[PDB]
Design a protein around this ligand. Structure first.
Ligand SMILES: Nc1nc2c(ncn2[C@@H]2O[C@H](COP(=O)(O)OP(=O)(O)OP(=O)(O)O)[C@@H](O)[C@H]2O)c(=O)[nH]1
Ligand SMILES: Nc1nc2c(ncn2[C@@H]2O[C@H](COP(=O)(O)OP(=O)(O)OP(=O)(O)O)[C@@H](O)[C@H]2O)c(=O)[nH]1
Ligand SMILES: [Mg+2]
Ligand SMILES: [Mg+2]
Lengths: 137, 180, 415, 18, 180
């Protein structure tokens, strides 16, 4: 994906610029399909982020996560809802199965510093689903 | 990339700029806008909504959007805050009772972080009666010197005569453009 | 519990009537017209009339009054539902609702009336199902009506499986003359035109606030629909359990779900109107329209209706963008705009004379209504997630849907 | 094309929810 | 579009114009209208209603509509304001008691927002008795110089003879027509 590779450097720079701690409406591109990210797609995205870097070890922040989700939605049409973290306290596991990224403490749950960490077993083990069976339906 | 087209356009004039027209009702804003656009004293009913026009002078197309000062239209000025580069406040020195209301409305309008790059533009309207104050008493009453990070200038313009509008336009152009 | 449903005409002539219980004489229809005339002339006219111990409930159709007489304390709501179903069936079978078709298809009309309801109890209401047993151009009744699935006919085969959805938005704004918006409600509409093979069972999934909260994803933009009403094919139990939207889509265009919730956002269009009406001399129309919608969206076919004076004449229009045409039939000025990009600001200055003689009676102040319709715009932010299309035989579906935003009850109170 | 918003392809279910 | 037909019509004279006749009763309005149209002093009863006629002079058809000065007809002048482009005022300098009433009526009629494009046309009637005032004393008493945005012209005409009517017509033509 040439577009994803091109957007990765700018996205990483924007995420780094934003510290760790205006227009209204919901415009939609015409004919662009919209659907949630798949497990295989999530695994591929996690692998691409790990290979390109800038995602593993970065301090977790709401603004950076929102920017990354918006960039992913713009570049692929995947809804920015699969990049969710498991409830704390402690390590936050990915909400969507197949994701290779997770948030772990680096030191109230909101005051805890979290960092994105790669996890290959997440794409194969549903740790978040086991922890929260009710949330998975 | 090449920017030869931009230089060619600027050699003959490309910058246009923008402007905003806000203030209390019956403050001469509509008359000032009409004089800037046409140059005649036109009589109109009170501005229920707003008027948008453009003025071509000094190679800059200063588009000004007049806004009324009605009670139901006072909170409607937030729609013009999107894609705005300037803001003009029209004072009414002949209305002592509405001076406090105009000051409160101006403070509310300037207390928004969205309108930060728009410098202050205060015009003294109704400069035809002896009761009108000078260019310093009105500024002192409004406290224009206490506006942090705001470039404010007081200019006196007469709606009936039209004098002083050129000075205000030149000041606005100098604030917007910082070139030769 | 209506005694007989009949179809009348504008001159009081009954286009067609069909008794179902026989407890009321057919001659009572003659007294319906004088009663309606008296009620209208005295302001007591209501859809449900009453001729002594018999109530004559009627609704105003395109050209005739669907009067359904009754004698006992029957279900008025049931009668209204039956009348609505009959109107929908007539619209499906007959493209026009006028006297030209009432007197043209009576041969099939009598059969349809007999089959639809018996003894005051409606029995058949599926227009597609009814078209398989009653035609104007007969076999045994279909088993789909007898079967549980009365909204998905089995055995339907199509070369392709294409379903066209419609995300219809209804922007209703009630802005008082004081400048404040009182009634700001947005009604969603999920209508799909399904054309596939077999009896697919749609498995709908969208960005609902309740569903996201239950799944734990209540942090992104999710629509919190105050009122969500599923269609007939929608299973109530599945939605009641875990918001599972599983139902068998019908063959053709149908309304699956219709969201309905209030809106706390700014109006898409800000209209400021001024009235410089001289005392029998002239009038001013200081109409200013501010587009509060996103600049990336354009309002196609914008028609801001501005009510002009009833006796006003010789109007002059001084506007900036959009054609202005004064229609004497409507007695108002329509600020017609072909395409209105978001963030646009159009200024208009109306000016017309007035007769010297003052009017004998007041005319009122009708509200100003706009007819904006900006498609491909989702103000509510509700995003469809997936549509589970499953078939017993097994096929690859290609669903389609379009989001359309239009102007609903977007009226502005006049000064 | 078509007025009222062009038709867009839809998914089958929430792939991110398993 | 083409305007060749309009130019061809205007080559020999096309503009017509209009005129109004207002004033108090017994002010010589009927006699003045008869002299303008016919050229003689015709004795007429008080104008209960109004007189409508047209006069062709200088290639312009100046339509004149006489308006009475009756108490019940005083408020009826608003009806004639519609489709009216000119107005001629006839004063009665021989009625000292009615001078104030005529001035008040003129002020009330001059305070109409619809009648703005019509300039002042004051006719000094009854200019045959020694008690008649001059062209400035009457204007000073009526305050014609205080009519902002009103083109007023004071002319004295004798009803018995008719002197000065041509001068008033020429002044009206010059004020209305702005061509060679
Ligand atoms: N005579 C006179 N009146 C003035 C002068 N300047 C301002 N005014 C008054 O100010 C009013 C200005 O009206 P407009 O300019 O048309 O409209 P506006 O100032 O935007 O006020 P709103 O329409 O209510 O929003 C006029 O009605 C005048 O009465 C002036 O120089 N001379
Ligand atoms: N003797 C004399 N009388 C005049 C002269 N000018 C005006 N009048 C008087 O003014 C009166 C005006 O009469 P008319 O001109 O026929 O009608 P009018 O001016 O419209 O007055 P009303 O009909 O009552 O409204 C006459 O009856 C005369 O008595 C004048 O030059 N000489
Ligand atoms: Mg104004
Ligand atoms: Mg007379």
């Amino acid at each position: 994906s040439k577009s994803s590779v091109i957007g990765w450097p700018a996205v990483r720079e924007r995420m780094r610029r934003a510290e760790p701690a205006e227009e209204v409406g919901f415009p939609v591109t015409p004919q662009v399909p919209l659907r949630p990210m798949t497990y295989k797609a999530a695994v591929d995205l996690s692998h691409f982020l790990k290979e390109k870097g800038g995602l593993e070890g970065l301090i977790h922040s709401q603004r950076r996560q929102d920017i990354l989700d918006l960039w992913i939605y713009h570049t692929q049409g995947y809804f920015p809802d699969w990049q969710n973290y498991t409830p704390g306290p402690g390590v936050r596991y990915p909400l969507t199965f197949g994701w290779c990224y997770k948030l772990v403490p680096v030191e109230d749950p909101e005051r805890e510093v979290l960092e994105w960490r790669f996890d290959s077993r997440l794409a194969f083990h549903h740790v978040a689903r086991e922890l929260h069976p009710e949330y998975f339906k | 990339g090449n920017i030869f087209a931009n230089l060619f356009k600027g050699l003959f004039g490309k910058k246009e700029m923008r402007i905003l027209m806000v203030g209390l009702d019956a403050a001469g804003k509509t008359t000032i806008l009409y004089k800037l656009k046409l140059g005649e004293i036109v009589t109109t009913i009170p501005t229920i909504g707003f008027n948008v026009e453009t003025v071509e002078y000094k190679n800059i197309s200063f588009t000004v959007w007049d806004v009324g000062g009605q009670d139901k239209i006072r909170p409607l000025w937030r729609h013009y805050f999107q894609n705005t580069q300037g803001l003009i406040f029209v004072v009414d020195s002949n209305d002592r009772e509405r001076v406090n209301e105009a000051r409160e409305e101006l403070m509310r309008m300037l207390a928004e972080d969205e309108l930060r790059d728009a410098v202050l533009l205060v015009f003294a309207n109704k400069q035809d009666l002896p009761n009108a104050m000078n260019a310093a008493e009105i500024t002192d009453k409004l406290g224009l010197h206490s506006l942090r990070h705001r470039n404010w200038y007081i200019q006196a313009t007469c709606a009936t005569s039209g004098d002083g509008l050129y000075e205000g336009l030149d000041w606005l152009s100098n604030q917007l453009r910082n070139q030769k | 519990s209506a005694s007989a449903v009949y179809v009348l005409d504008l001159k009081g002539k009954v286009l067609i009537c069909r008794n179902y219980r026989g407890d009321v004489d057919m001659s009572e229809v003659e007294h319906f017209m004088p009663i309606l005339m008296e009620k209208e002339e005295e302001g007591m006219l209501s859809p449900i009339l009453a001729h002594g111990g018999v109530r004559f409930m009627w609704i105003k159709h395109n050209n005739l009054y669907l009067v359904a007489t009754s004698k006992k304390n029957a279900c008025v709501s049931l009668v209204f539902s039956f009348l609505y179903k009959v109107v929908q069936v007539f619209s499906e079978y007959f493209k026009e609702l006028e006297e030209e078709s009432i007197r043209d298809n009576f041969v099939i009309i009598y059969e349809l009336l007999d089959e639809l309801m018996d003894f005051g109890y409606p029995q058949t209401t599926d227009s597609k199902i009814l078209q398989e047993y009653i035609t104007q151009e007969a076999p045994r009744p279909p088993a789909t009506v007898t079967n549980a699935v009365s909204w998905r006919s089995e055995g339907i085969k199509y070369r392709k499986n294409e379903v066209f959805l419609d995300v219809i938005e209804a922007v209703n704004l009630l802005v008082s003359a004081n400048g404040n918006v009182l009634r700001s409600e947005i009604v969603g509409s999920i209508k799909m035109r399904v054309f596939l093979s077999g009896m697919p069972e749609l498995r709908l999934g969208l960005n609902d606030k309740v569903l996201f909260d239950n799944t734990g994803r209540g942090k992104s933009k999710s629509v919190e629909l105050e009122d969500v009403k599923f269609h007939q094919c929608v299973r109530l139990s599945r939605f009641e359990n875990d918001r599972t939207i599983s139902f068998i889509p019908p063959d053709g265009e149908f309304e699956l779900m219709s969201y309905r919730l209030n809106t706390h956002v700014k109006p898409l269009i800000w209209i400021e109107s001024v009235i410089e009406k001289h005392s029998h001399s002239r009038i001013e129309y200081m109409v200013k329209a501010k587009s509060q919608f996103k600049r990336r969206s354009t309002a196609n076919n914008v028609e801001i209706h501005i009510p002009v004076p009833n006796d006003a004449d010789s109007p002059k229009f001084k506007t900036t963008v959009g054609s202005v045409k004064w229609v004497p039939e409507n007695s108002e000025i329509v600020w017609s705009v072909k395409s209105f990009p978001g963030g646009k600001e159009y200024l208009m200055r109306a000016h017309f004379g007035l007769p010297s003689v003052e009017a004998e009676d007041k005319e009122g102040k009708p509200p100003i209504s706009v007819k904006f319709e900006i498609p491909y715009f989702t103000t509510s932010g509700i995003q469809v997630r997936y549509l589970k299309i499953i078939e017993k035989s097994g096929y690859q579906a290609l669903p389609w849907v379009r989001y359309i935003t239009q102007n609903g009850d977007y009226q502005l109170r006049t000064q | 094309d078509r007025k009222g918003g062009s038709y867009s392809q839809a998914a089958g279910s929430d792939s991110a929810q398993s």
